[PDB]
Amino acid sequence: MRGQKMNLTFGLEEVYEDAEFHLGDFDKVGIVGVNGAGKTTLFRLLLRELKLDKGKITIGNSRIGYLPQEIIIMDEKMTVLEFLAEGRPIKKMETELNYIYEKLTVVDDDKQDRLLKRMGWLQEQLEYFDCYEAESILLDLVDSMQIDFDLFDQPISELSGGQKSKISFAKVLYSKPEILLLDQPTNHLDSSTKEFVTKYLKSYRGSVLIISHDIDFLNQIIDKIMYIDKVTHKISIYEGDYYTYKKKYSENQLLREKMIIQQEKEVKELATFVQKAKQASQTNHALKRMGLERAIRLDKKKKNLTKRDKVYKRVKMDIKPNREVARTPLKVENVTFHYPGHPILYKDLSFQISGKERFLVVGENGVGKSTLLKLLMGINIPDKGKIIFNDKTDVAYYSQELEQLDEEKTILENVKSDEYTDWKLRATLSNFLFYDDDVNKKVNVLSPGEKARIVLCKVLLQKANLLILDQPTNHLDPETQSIIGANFNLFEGTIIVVSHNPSFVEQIGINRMLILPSGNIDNYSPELLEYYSN
Amino acid sequence: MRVNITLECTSCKERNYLTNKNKRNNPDRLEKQKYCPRERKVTLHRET
RNA sequence: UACAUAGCUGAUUAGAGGUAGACGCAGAGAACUGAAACAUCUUAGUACCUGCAGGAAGAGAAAGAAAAUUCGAUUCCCUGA
RNA sequence: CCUGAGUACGGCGGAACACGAGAAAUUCCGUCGGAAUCCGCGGGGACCAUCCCGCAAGGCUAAAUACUCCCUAGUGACCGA
RNA sequence: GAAGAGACGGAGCCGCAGCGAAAGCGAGUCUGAAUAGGGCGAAUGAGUAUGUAGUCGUAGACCCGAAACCAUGUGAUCUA
RNA sequence: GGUAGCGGAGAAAUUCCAAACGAACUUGGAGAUAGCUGGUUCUCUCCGAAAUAGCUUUAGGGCUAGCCUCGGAAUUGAGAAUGAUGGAGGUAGAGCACUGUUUGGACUAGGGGCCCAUCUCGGGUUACCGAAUUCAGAUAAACUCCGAAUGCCAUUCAUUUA
RNA sequence: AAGCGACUGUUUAUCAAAAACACAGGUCUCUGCAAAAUCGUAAGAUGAAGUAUAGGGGCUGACGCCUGCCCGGUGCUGGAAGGUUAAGAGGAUGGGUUAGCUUCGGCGAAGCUCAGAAUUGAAGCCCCAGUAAACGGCGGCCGUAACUAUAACGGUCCUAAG
RNA sequence: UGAGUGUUUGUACCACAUGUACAGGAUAGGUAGGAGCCGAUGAGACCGGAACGCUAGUUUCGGAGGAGGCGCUGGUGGGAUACUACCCUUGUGUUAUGAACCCUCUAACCCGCACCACUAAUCGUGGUGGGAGACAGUGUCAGAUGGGCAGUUUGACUGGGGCGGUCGCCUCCUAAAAGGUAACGGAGGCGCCCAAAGGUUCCCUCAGAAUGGUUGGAAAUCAUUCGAAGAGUGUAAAGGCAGAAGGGAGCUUGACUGCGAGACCUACAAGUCGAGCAGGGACGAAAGUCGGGCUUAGUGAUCCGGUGGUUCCGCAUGGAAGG
RNA sequence: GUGGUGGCGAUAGCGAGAAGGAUACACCUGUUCCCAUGCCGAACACAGAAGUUAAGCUUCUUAGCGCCGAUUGUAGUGAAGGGUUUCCCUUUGUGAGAGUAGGACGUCGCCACG
RNA sequence: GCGGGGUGGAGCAGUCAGGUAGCUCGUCGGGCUCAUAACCCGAAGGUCGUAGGUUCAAAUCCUGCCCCCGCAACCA
RNA sequence: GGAGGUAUGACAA
Ligand SMILES: Nc1ncnc2c1ncn2[C@@H]1O[C@H](COP(=O)(O)OP(=O)(O)OP(=O)(O)O)[C@@H](O)[C@H]1O
Ligand SMILES: Nc1ncnc2c1ncn2[C@@H]1O[C@H](COP(=O)(O)OP(=O)(O)OP(=O)(O)O)[C@@H](O)[C@H]1O
Ligand SMILES: [K+]
Ligand SMILES: [K+]
Ligand SMILES: [K+]
Ligand SMILES: [K+]
Ligand SMILES: [K+]
Ligand SMILES: [K+]
Ligand SMILES: [K+]
Ligand SMILES: [K+]
Ligand SMILES: [K+]
Ligand SMILES: [K+]
Ligand SMILES: [K+]
Ligand SMILES: [K+]
Ligand SMILES: [K+]
Ligand SMILES: [K+]
Ligand SMILES: [K+]
Numbered sequence A: 001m002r003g004q005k006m007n008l009t010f011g012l013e014e015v016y017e018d019a020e021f022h023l024g025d026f027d028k029v030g031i032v033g034v035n036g037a038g039k040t041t042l043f044r045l046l047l048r049e050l051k052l053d054k055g056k057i058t059i060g061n062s063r064i065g066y067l068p069q070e071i072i073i074m075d076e077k078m079t080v081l082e083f084l085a086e087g088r089p090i091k092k093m094e095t096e097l098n099y100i101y102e103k104l105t106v107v108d109d110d111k112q113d114r115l116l117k118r119m120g121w122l123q124e125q126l127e128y129f130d131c132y133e134a135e136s137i138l139l140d141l142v143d144s145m146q147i148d149f150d151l152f153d154q155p156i157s158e159l160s161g162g163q164k165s166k167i168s169f170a171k172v173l174y175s176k177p178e179i180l181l182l183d184q185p186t187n188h189l190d191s192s193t194k195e196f197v198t199k200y201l202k203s204y205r206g207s208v209l210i211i212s213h214d215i216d217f218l219n220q221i222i223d224k225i226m227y228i229d230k231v232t233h234k235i236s237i238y239e240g241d242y243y244t245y246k247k248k249y250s251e252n253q254l255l256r257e258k259m260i261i262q263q264e265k266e267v268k269e270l271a272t273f274v275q276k277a278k279q280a281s282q283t284n285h286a287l288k289r290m291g292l293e294r295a296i297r298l299d300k301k302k303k304n305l306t307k308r309d310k311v312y313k314r315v316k317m318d319i320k321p322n323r324e325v326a327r328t329p330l331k332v333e334n335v336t337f338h339y340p341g342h343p344i345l346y347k348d349l350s351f352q353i354s355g356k357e358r359f360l361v362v363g364e365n366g367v368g369k370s371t372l373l374k375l376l377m378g379i380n381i382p383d384k385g386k387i388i389f390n391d392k393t394d395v396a397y398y399s400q401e402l403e404q405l406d407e408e409k410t411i412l413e414n415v416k417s418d419e420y421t422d423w424k425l426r427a428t429l430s431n432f433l434f435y436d437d438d439v440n441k442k443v444n445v446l447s448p449g450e451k452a453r454i455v456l457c458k459v460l461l462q463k464a465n466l467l468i469l470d471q472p473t474n475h476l477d478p479e480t481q482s483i484i485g486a487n488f489n490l491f492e493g494t495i496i497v498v499s500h501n502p503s504f505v506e507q508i509g510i511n512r513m514l515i516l517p518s519g520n521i522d523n524y525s526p527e528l529l530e531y532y533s534n
Numbered sequence B: 001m002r003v004n005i006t007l008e009c010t011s012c013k014e015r016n017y018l019t020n021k022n023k024r025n026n027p028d029r030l031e032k033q034k035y036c037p038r039e040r041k042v043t044l045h046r047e048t
Numbered sequence C: 001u002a003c004a005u006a007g008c009u010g011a012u013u014a015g016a017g018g019u020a021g022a023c024g025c026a027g028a029g030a031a032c033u034g035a036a037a038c039a040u041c042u043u044a045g046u047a048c049c050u051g052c053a054g055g056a057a058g059a060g061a062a063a064g065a066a067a068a069u070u071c072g073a074u075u076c077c078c079u080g081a
Numbered sequence D: 001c002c003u004g005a006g007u008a009c010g011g012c013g014g015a016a017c018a019c020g021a022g023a024a025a026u027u028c029c030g031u032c033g034g035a036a037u038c039c040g041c042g043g044g045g046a047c048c049a050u051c052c053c054g055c056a057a058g059g060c061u062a063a064a065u066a067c068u069c070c071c072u073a074g075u076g077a078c079c080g081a
Numbered sequence E: 001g002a003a004g005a006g007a008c009g010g011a012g013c014c015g016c017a018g019c020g021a022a023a024g025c026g027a028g029u030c031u032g033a034a035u036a037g038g039g040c041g042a043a044u045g046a047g048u049a050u051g052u053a054g055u056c057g058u059a060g061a062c063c064c065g066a067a068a069c070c071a072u073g074u075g076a077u078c079u080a
Numbered sequence F: 001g002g003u004a005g006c007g008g009a010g011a012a013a014u015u016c017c018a019a020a021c022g023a024a025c026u027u028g029g030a031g032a033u034a035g036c037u038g039g040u041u042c043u044c045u046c047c048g049a050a051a052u053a054g055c056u057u058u059a060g061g062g063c064u065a066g067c068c069u070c071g072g073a074a075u076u077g078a079g080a081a082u083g084a085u086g087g088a089g090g091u092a093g094a095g096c097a098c099u100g101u102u103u104g105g106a107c108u109a110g111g112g113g114c115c116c117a118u119c120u121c122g123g124g125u126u127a128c129c130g131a132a133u134u135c136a137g138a139u140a141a142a143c144u145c146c147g148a149a150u151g152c153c154a155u156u157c158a159u160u161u162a
Numbered sequence G: 001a002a003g004c005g006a007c008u009g010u011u012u013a014u015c016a017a018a019a020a021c022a023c024a025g026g027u028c029u030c031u032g033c034a035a036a037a038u039c040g041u042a043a044g045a046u047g048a049a050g051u052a053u054a055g056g057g058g059c060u061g062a063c064g065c066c067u068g069c070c071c072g073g074u075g076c077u078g079g080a081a082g083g084u085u086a087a088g089a090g091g092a093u094g095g096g097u098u099a100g101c102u103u104c105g106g107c108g109a110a111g112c113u114c115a116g117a118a119u120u121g122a123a124g125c126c127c128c129a130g131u132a133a134a135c136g137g138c139g140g141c142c143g144u145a146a147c148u149a150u151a152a153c154g155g156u157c158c159u160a161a162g
Numbered sequence H: 001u002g003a004g005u006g007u008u009u010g011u012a013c014c015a016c017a018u019g020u021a022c023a024g025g026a027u028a029g030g031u032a033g034g035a036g037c038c039g040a041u042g043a044g045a046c047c048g049g050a051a052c053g054c055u056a057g058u059u060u061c062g063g064a065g066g067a068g069g070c071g072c073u074g075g076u077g078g079g080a081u082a083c084u085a086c087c088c089u090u091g092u093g094u095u096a097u098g099a100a101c102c103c104u105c106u107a108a109c110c111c112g113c114a115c116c117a118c119u120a121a122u123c124g125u126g127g128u129g130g131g132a133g134a135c136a137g138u139g140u141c142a143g144a145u146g147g148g149c150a151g152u153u154u155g156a157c158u159g160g161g162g163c164g165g166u167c168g169c170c171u172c173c174u175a176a177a178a179g180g181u182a183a184c185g186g187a188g189g190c191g192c193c194c195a196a197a198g199g200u201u202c203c204c205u206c207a208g209a210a211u212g213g214u215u216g217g218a219a220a221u222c223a224u225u226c227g228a229a230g231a232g233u234g235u236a237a238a239g240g241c242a243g244a245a246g247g248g249a250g251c252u253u254g255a256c257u258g259c260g261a262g263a264c265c266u267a268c269a270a271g272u273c274g275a276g277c278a279g280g281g282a283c284g285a286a287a288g289u290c291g292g293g294c295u296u297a298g299u300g301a302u303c304c305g306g307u308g309g310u311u312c313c314g315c316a317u318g319g320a321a322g323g
Numbered sequence I: 001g002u003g004g005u006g007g008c009g010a011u012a013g014c015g016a017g018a019a020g021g022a023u024a025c026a027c028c029u030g031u032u033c034c035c036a037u038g039c040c041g042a043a044c045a046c047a048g049a050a051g052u053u054a055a056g057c058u059u060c061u062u063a064g065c066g067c068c069g070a071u072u073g074u075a076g077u078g079a080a081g082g083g084u085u086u087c088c089c090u091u092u093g094u095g096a097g098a099g100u101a102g103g104a105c106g107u108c109g110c111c112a113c114g
Numbered sequence J: 001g002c003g004g005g006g007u008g009g010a011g012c013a014g015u016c017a018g019g020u021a022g023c024u025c026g027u028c029g030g031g032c033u034c035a036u037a038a039c040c041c042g043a044a045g046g047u048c049g050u051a052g053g054u055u056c057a058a059a060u061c062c063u064g065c066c067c068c069c070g071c072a073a074c075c076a
Numbered sequence K: 001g002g003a004g005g006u007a008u009g010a011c012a013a
């Protein structure tokens, strides 16, 4: 993998400017960058989905296993087995091969040469992708992540976010690839599932490029770290782990900063002398002469004076509730719910939040965490029981899968609210790093991370006193995650949160944790690990 | 930002026309129905 | 230092130096000047210096010129321009 | 069986070819690397194939050519203190 | 051949065809999709060898004049 | 006796190195170069400038054009002068129709302090200050409702001329 | 009686004899000997037939009392993890040619050939520390006491230090 | 410029070991052959050791003993059983090694060390020790540093020169009613902008003032009247435009291709305008308009280089390189 | 007489007043129709003929404004001269602007209905 | 003419690179103290010199204007 | 029991 003079500019906002990178074979490369840096775009170039405006991107002929950042569900009714089976080209070739046979009967002596060649390639290709895979896939689920077979016959769209990530990850492995392009492979996974992925990737003998915002996950796997710069629009490749990249990077910007300081001092020195000559008497010929001579040096300095790159601005969140919380924001009493045709998730579930409380809904993948939150909002109607919100409680919902955005509309159109004027919307969008005509961009072209900011901005603009957040730190770059956690910690309201990120929950400072599926309203503590272990 | 640009004929890949556009006002590649002298007929020309 | 060799002695041999302020070959090799400035370039491989010469020197008997199909060492003059 | 080896040639750095590295052959110098040998080798202006021409890395060779310090005999719309 | 004229020597040069960057075509040719227009040409012809004079180019180039630059040499009998 | 010029020597002054040293002297390149100064030699005849435009590391230089001279070709004679006729243009002058500058008068929105009334609400006042309007009066290179004399362009025109 | 220079000396032969140079003394720094330094392409010399109490270089200039603050910048000295970096080594890939295949198509082995990335690659530079008798540098604004002035004193900005 | 040691590494053979997913007799690497094969050259079964191990077992070593097993066959599975070959993963070693470093060696090279001879000799050349040593020195190439040294550059206008200002382009006044016309004369602008703020068809007419009118005020939006331009015309000024060039809507891309009689301007190079012809279009019923924008600034010669196209050339020829 | 449609510098206009609809033109009645209003059949579009000259429109009166504008004189000025020469004057030719006498409430055509 | 500055009472940030008016001292009120100082707790104090543009949005960008400071305003 | 060592506060009253 090699790229030379890479250039890419979508409209007015550019991604790569004379960027270059060389990746040696058998390198577990960790791709790192802020949201929007262009990490996903790099894979699209490797997959030939995109074409560089200028420059050459060179890829090896080996087969590539691509794990998209977003799950590709062509149809809602697709079953898990259908989704996985599509990983291999067995089905596609057979449909083509079956047609070839039909043509052979119809055509006698005209197209036989072309048909025979096509049939031969399909047979050779089919045997190359040995048709015994039908059995191998069935057991790949068992050995991979303990994926139950009941899911195997279920529509994929109905799976949980963590479950979908397992299926998508398994599909990549099912394809039997030669180069691994993993785009956030652990976005929704729980702690246990992440362990399997880490171990497999450590053992994987081939090249694997990983786009991840999990530093610890990368450190265990990565041997080479590729940093996509958002301000310089360039690529830099370091040897080592995430920390090594930060150490090397922080030093380079420090050494660059000191260079710019000294160049400014020399310019100021000349400038100061030029001014002294400029204001001297016209009768002081020698000083006037020297002033013009130094004016020439000053001009040449100012033309070779390196510009300091504008440090990328970090998100600023100020979430405040309009109204005040009550002692009983939310009442859940004897609530039972089951998805038609599936086991009851919880029976007679009853809890009561206190107000300005950090309430954590703990659990594992596919246990009902997101179902419970959907239950509170009203998306799901409880099979039994009642859910009562105090009249003082305003609720803001952050869905897990980013289902609250219109892909067709623009950023500004999405955030449009009856309670906010235009400039008010722009100011907040600037706090979320959407500057000027960046707000007229269609939501369909944004990255998952940039979309997550829009959803958060919608939550902020509500000014609700109860925050129902379902994995808020998902898709966010590590810097933005800490800002999110720190600001929520200071939030003066009740927070119902779900998060598989240990760091984020620590910053928020959880008070009570609700374990699933075994309903257990408990005081928050390092005993969370005990429930996870058990 | 206003920049000079070239309109290439889609049919023949011929860079027939030179023009200019404001990137901010027209982020997407400009497309016009212009006469292609090589093909001697109107064709779709897209910026490159 | 043993054989030797080196040194030393003798005999034998052929060089030294000068020109014709010319001509030839070679080593080394400027600057003013021109470019309307100036560094690449030009003056110029010139002036100067040094070596070797001969009456001439140098070159010369194709691992060539060509592609009319062919020519048949070298040198010099006309022409190509 | 013989037909010129640390050679031809190549990299690097210079130089000579009208040709200033240029697409640049051809020739030479220094340094390093470094062939084939008749089914072989070189050249025909990068390079390759075909075709044509030639046979390097050894030597010698008169004449046509350059010059006149001198000697002999003359010449001049050359000088005339 | 007298340091001559002259004789031989037709290799070569100029002119008799131009247009186009070039392939190329030719009283035309180039541009152009074009029998269009337009450009340059032909229609609408005089050249060439030599003498002479004017002017120009290369040469010191109408004559005299630097401060200087460069390359061999000669100078410490004054003076340090 | 030694140190020699791309140098020497210097208790240091650019000081000395054969009577002038910010780089000795002599010969050669060499007739260096000099957009600079000086000089450039007989006669008569015909005609006779320019000191301007443009560009220029250009400004006391140069190039093209303009102006002079010599020869030639050709024309529906195209030049000059004057007249007749027709036109383009905004100057002198003048004017205020616009735009600026501006004087006095009338009226006045409005603004100023005085008191009553103050919830500062309404007066009544300075021949208080006063926009706009209006009357009268000026003013203009970068004002014009107007507008010459002249000059200019042109005419198959006329007369004279070349 | 004052300035300058401690002093005797030296200097612009030929407009300057001096406060200029030298000087003894001070200090810094280089130099372990085929020393450093210098002349020279080299050989060979001086240094020195000397050896750190010696030799070279910079500054200051008897003697007496003293010689404050700043190592941020520039030099020098030391450091060696990291970044950057030449030739050379290396040779993944991509062109040119064509034996051969080929569905006008087009593909294409070997050889030769034109380019060539990864990787490797010293010093230096960046970086860290020290060094001022190394090159150098050595601040502002506002307010305060019993008349008034002034400010011992108080704020605050800047700097490597004021 | 040559020997070794060791270390860390890259390569290549050669030995070794390893292959357990579901089913499957069970630890099934792939392919090919395979009915037959192996064992008194010590088989089966048994026992101990060791290894691997997915914990199920597999491999190997040995004690005794002595003759046997395995395969085919059979069912499983996608794949079948022995054994052979070709190999393929994984991790052990041997060898060949190639590098990087490590020191050690000695014979090259070096000695302004000692002694010996040439020999009168502080030169030199040899000889013997000693020291050092593949370093150093030297050659070629490369980076760094390098006023120590060298060749040069370091504007012009200008009420002298300096300082300040200016240098190209557009508009006005100066400018003397054609055009042109200077000053370091008086004023300003430009180095763009517009995907409509372009084209076309259709449609519309402004600024202000008075009166009335919730929030609402001098002044937001609304209505009548008065209103010839006192508005607007992207952007300076002048000229022009209300038969619009100002404003709105629909459709569009003529902000076209090849040109171009003839004009203006002009030292040249350039600059400006252009009916009209053809090709193929936009709008409109048609007429007809359209080769950008109300007009006049919004720009830069050549050389050199980049990208794209091309029936052009291609140094014997075909290509190519390069034009 | 009216309605279309043009030429000519508004001497054609504007303001004010008066008269007329027989036809014609208009207002005028409606929105089902093609068609339409960034809302509105107001407008545009279409259908239609109950009423009215009220307005527009036509004709007529008026010089209030606007417009046109002779002559005389003057400013300037070409040419030729002068002076006491930043200016001024004379001869000759030309001659405004302003201010006025006055002009003028249009004229010249074609069509269709009368 | 050349520069530097106008942000709460004072000294300063912010400004380059448009989104949110801060830091130090001070003032006011209340605490602590026998009282004062220090200290502790609350509060006030600017729409960024001013007027216009640019922008969805200006302390920030553009133009002008007014103030304050240093310098210059002439050389043989 | 003894001995040598290890922040501010006029003045008078
Ligand atoms: N078709 C597009 N049009 C306009 N902008 C685009 C388009 N595609 C991508 N961009 C921009 O490219 C930028 C970077 O691309 P990319 O989506 O790969 O970022 P990312 O690092 O992968 O995001 P994240 O890490 O949060 O998943 C995005 O901010 C996105 O706004
Ligand atoms: N619309 C649905 N239809 C049918 N079954 C569903 C549906 N949604 C969820 N399920 C099932 O509910 C179970 C849990 O629901 P839920 O989406 O809340 O999982 P979760 O707690 O969010 O897990 P995680 O977020 O970690 O992936 C899943 O197994 C999932 O298969
Ligand atoms: K001679
Ligand atoms: K020269
Ligand atoms: K010159
Ligand atoms: K010879
Ligand atoms: K060459
Ligand atoms: K040849
Ligand atoms: K040959
Ligand atoms: K033609
Ligand atoms: K023609
Ligand atoms: K003749
Ligand atoms: K002649
Ligand atoms: K001469
Ligand atoms: K001459
Ligand atoms: K002497
Ligand atoms: K002296």
Ligand SMILES: [K+]
Pocket (backbone or CB within 6 Å): F096
């Ligand atoms: K006026």
Ligand SMILES: [K+]
Pocket (backbone or CB within 6 Å): none
């Ligand atoms: K005027």
Ligand SMILES: [K+]
Pocket (backbone or CB within 6 Å): G005
């Ligand atoms: K002295």
Ligand SMILES: [K+]
Pocket (backbone or CB within 6 Å): G006, G023
């Ligand atoms: K002294």
Ligand SMILES: [K+]
Pocket (backbone or CB within 6 Å): none
């Ligand atoms: K003293």
Ligand SMILES: [K+]
Pocket (backbone or CB within 6 Å): G017
């Ligand atoms: K004296």
Ligand SMILES: [K+]
Pocket (backbone or CB within 6 Å): F012, G011, G020, G021
């Ligand atoms: K002296």
Ligand SMILES: [K+]
Pocket (backbone or CB within 6 Å): none
């Ligand atoms: K002292």
Ligand SMILES: [K+]
Pocket (backbone or CB within 6 Å): none
């Ligand atoms: K000293």
Ligand SMILES: [K+]
Pocket (backbone or CB within 6 Å): G059
């Ligand atoms: K010093």
Ligand SMILES: [K+]
Pocket (backbone or CB within 6 Å): none
């Ligand atoms: K001393």
Ligand SMILES: [K+]
Pocket (backbone or CB within 6 Å): G071
């Ligand atoms: K310092």
Ligand SMILES: [K+]
Pocket (backbone or CB within 6 Å): G071
């Ligand atoms: K320092």
Ligand SMILES: [K+]
Pocket (backbone or CB within 6 Å): none
């Ligand atoms: K090949």
Ligand SMILES: [K+]
Pocket (backbone or CB within 6 Å): none
């Ligand atoms: K060596």
Ligand SMILES: [K+]
Pocket (backbone or CB within 6 Å): H159
């Ligand atoms: K003067």
